Amino acid sequence: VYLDRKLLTLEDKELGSGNFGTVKKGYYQMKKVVKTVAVKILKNEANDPALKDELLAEANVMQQLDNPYIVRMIGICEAESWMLVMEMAELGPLNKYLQQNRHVTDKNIIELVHQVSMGMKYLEESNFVHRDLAARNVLLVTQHYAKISDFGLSKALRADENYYKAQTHGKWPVKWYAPECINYYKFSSKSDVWSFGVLMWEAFSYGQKPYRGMKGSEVTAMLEKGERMGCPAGCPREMYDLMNLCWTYDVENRPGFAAVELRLRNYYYDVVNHHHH
Numbered sequence: 622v623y624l625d626r627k628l629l630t631l632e633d634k635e636l637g638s639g640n641f642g643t644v645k646k647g648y649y650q651m652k653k654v655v656k657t658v659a660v661k662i663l664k665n666e667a668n669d670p671a672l673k674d675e676l677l678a679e680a681n682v683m684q685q686l687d688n689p690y691i692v693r694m695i696g697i698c699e700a701e702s703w704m705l706v707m708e709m710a711e712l713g714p715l716n717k718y719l720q721q722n723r724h725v726t727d728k729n730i731i732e733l734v735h736q737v738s739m740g741m742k743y744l745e746e747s748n749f750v751h752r753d754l755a756a757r758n759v760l761l762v763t764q765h766y767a768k769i770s771d772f773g774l775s776k777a778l779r780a781d782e783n784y785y786k787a788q789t790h791g792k793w794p795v796k797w798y799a800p801e802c803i804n805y806y807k808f809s810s811k812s813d814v815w816s817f818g819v820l821m822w823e824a825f826s827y828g829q830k831p832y833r834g835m836k837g838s839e840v841t842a843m844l845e846k847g848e849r850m851g852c853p854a855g856c857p858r859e860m861y862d863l864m865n866l867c868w869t870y871d872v873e874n875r876p877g878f879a880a881v882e883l884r885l886r887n888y889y890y891d892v893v894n895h896h897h898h
């Protein structure tokens with residue numbers, strides 16, 4: 622959990638940023654092997670304690686998670702700034718990857734979004750809400766291995782509640798948010814199912830931004846009229862049907878991740894069967 626700064630080598634180049642911090646590539650000297658890592662650091666000229674708490678809360682969520690489809694935390698270190706050391710997903714965000722690799726097949730996309738549903742089925746069983754589930758947060762280890770990242774807005778649900786009630790609205794990724802998040806500030810695993818539907822749309826659209834050219838308020842007004850984004854070009858009908866099911870307005874009738882992962886699992890095997898024929 623607490624790492625040694627002398628065993629960490631950071632490269633100067635920045636990969637990008639999350640809800641909090643900036644990610645740099647590094648190397649960590651493990652018990653024997655050297656491990657390539659992604660290190661989230663803080664740009665905090667003012668020495669604001671809030672920036673440190675946000676990164677530590679993020680580290681606290683990751684420490685409790687252990688799944689093949691979730692980015693693993695190696696540990697933390699307090700040096701030039703607080704640093705959250707994670708495993709490295711070399712290929713990066715799924716939306717940026719697909720934008721640059723249009724040859725990726727529908728079979729390959731189903732495989733990757735199914736892997737995201739396995740990680741989310743795990744997160745839901747663990748009673749954590751992601752709250753920022755989007756293609757930009759799905760990181761590729763390989764073209765055939767996706768992992769969920771950025772737990773900056775994530776919350777451990779209370780033992781007596783199935784949702785997190787936000788106190789402050791903030792800079793919210795509204796285009797990925799369910800109507801109950803917008804209308805009641807209530808975040809559940811079912812709210813994450815809604816974001817997963819938007820993520821699926823982004824994946825089948827080869828990383829295109831959802832609701833293009835629309836303001837957040839126009840998206841809310843569209844969804845309220847019962848309108849949904851159209852089927853992406855070349856997206857299988859079974860996959861567009863599943864996105865629409867994720868976009869069930871009423872939180873009670875919306876499927877949970879166990880039902881979502883099963884649909885994708887069965888569809889993926891049908892496509893694997895089609896390919897062999």
Ligand SMILES: COc1ccc(-c2cc3ncsc3c(O[C@H](C)[C@H]3CNC(=O)C3)n2)cc1OC
Nearest residue numbers: 636637638639644659709710711712713770771
């Ligand atoms: C080819 O380009 C890239 C290759 C790898 C990365 C990369 C690898 C990586 N591994 C672990 S966290 C991580 C990460 O973080 C991101 C900056 C955000 C997503 N989630 C967060 O928390 C922050 N980015 C990024 C790339 O370009 C944007």
